[PDB]
Structure 1
Amino acid sequence: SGEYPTVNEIPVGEVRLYQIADGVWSHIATQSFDGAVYPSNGLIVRDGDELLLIDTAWGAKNTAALLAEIEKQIGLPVTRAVSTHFHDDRVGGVDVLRAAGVATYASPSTRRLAEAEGNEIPTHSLEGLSSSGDAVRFGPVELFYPGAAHSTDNLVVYVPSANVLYGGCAVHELSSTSAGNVADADLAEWPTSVERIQKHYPEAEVVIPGHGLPGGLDLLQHTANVVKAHKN
């Protein structure tokens, strides 16, 4: 009924959208992993009379449900998708997208990691993002590689028309008490990577984490704080 939808509010298999700004939505789905249920976010950005998708909904069936929810709520075709790192909450569902007419993209680093680990593999490589601080334009967004954080390949996405910063899993929500799933993380480099995001996007108005509630710029400092303390 208007609040940001939360883990116990979304059965696994169902997807919700949340309007962030004009032409910008997040998508929220839930999935089971190792016997616990988690929410996760992605982004939808209006690209004229088409849509750009950022990240899958964490699984094939969730991603099919995402497409159906977009058709119901927005009614414009998803033509391209970008996955912001190689994990299943970002690429699981790429095969569904690829069979629904969507062109799927990720950095070569993400594609390699996804292939090596047995995750679904986006079709197209995004060059120009291999060094920290690199940025490229992709439709209505800018893609930015901040350096290693949650993963070595993680990308962030900025929507300049709306000053929306989608941090993906490199950014944690304010209620976070831990650095999340750190299996593939670089806790030593993570604060430096967050500082790069802070420096590059000082005018961000909304910051969206990979999991949990959006907020403002404080999510970046909070993330740095919880990762440093986790490492400690």
Structure 2
Amino acid sequence: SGEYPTVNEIPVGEVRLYQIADGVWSHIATQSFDGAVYPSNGLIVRDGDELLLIDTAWGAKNTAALLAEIEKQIGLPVTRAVSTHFHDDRVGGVDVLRAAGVATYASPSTRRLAEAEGNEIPTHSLEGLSSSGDAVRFGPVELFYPGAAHSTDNLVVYVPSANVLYGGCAVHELSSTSAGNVADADLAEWPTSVERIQKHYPEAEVVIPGHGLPGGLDLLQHTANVVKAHKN
């Protein structure tokens, strides 16, 4: 009934949308992994009479449910998707998208990592993002490569019309007590990468983490804090 939906409020397989700003929504889904249930976020950005999707809903059936929820709540076609790193909460569902008319994109790094680790593989490579600090425009967003953080390939997304910063899994929610799943993380580089985000997007008004509740710019500093304390 209007608050941001949390992990215990979304059964695995169902998707909810949350209006962030005019023409900007997050999507929230839940998934089981190693015997625990986790929420995850993605983004939807209105692109004229089309929609740009950022990240899958963490699995094929969740991503089919995402498409159905978008048609119910928004009713515009998803034409393009970007995955912001290679893990299953970002690319799991790319095959569903690709069979539903969606052109799927990721950096070449993400594509190579997804292929090597047996995850689903976006079709199109996003050049111009291979050095930290790089930025490119993609429809109504800017894609930014901050450097290694949660993963070496992680991208963040800015919606300039709304000053919405979608951090993906390089950014954690304020309640987080650790740096999440650090399997592929670079804990030493992560604070430097967060500093790059902070410097590049100082006018962000909403910051959305890869998992959990959106907030303001404090999510970036909180992320740096928990990552440094995790590493130590």
TM-score w.r.t. the length of structure 2 is: 1.00
In the TM superposition, residue 73 of structure 1 has moved relative to its aligned partner by 0.1
Uncovered stretches (5+) of structure 1, i.e. residues with no partner:
none
In the TM superposition, residue 14 of structure 1 has moved relative to its aligned partner by 0.0
SS at match of 1:90: helix
TM-score w.r.t. the length of structure 1 is: 1.00
In the TM superposition, residue 163 of structure 1 has moved relative to its aligned partner by 0.1
Matches of 2:107 and 2:183 in 1, distance apart? 20
In the TM superposition, residue 138 of structure 1 has moved relative to its aligned partner by 0.0
Query: Hey, what does 1:170 align to over in structure 2?
Result: 170
The superposition leaves residues 173-229 of structure 1 with CA deviations (integer Å, 9 ceiling, x where unpaired) of 000000000000000000000000000000000000000000000000000000000
The superposition leaves residues 143-187 of structure 1 with CA deviations (integer Å, 9 ceiling, x where unpaired) of 000000000000000000000000000000000000000000000
SS at match of 2:79: strand
Matches of 1:88 and 1:108 in 2, distance apart? 16
In the TM superposition, residue 12 of structure 1 has moved relative to its aligned partner by 0.1
Matches of 1:158 and 1:61 in 2, distance apart? 27
RMSD: 0.1
| Alignment pair present for 1:5 and 2:9 | no
Matches of 1:135 and 1:46 in 2, distance apart? 20
Matches of 2:202 and 2:185 in 1, distance apart? 25
SS at match of 1:62: helix
SS at match of 1:42: strand
Number of positions where the alignment pairs a residue of Structure 1 with one of Structure 2:
232
Matches of 2:165 and 2:179 in 1, distance apart? 19
Query: Displaced runs of 4+ in structure 1, greater than 4 A?
Result: none
- Aligned-residue identity in percent: 100
Matches of 2:50 and 2:231 in 1, distance apart? 42
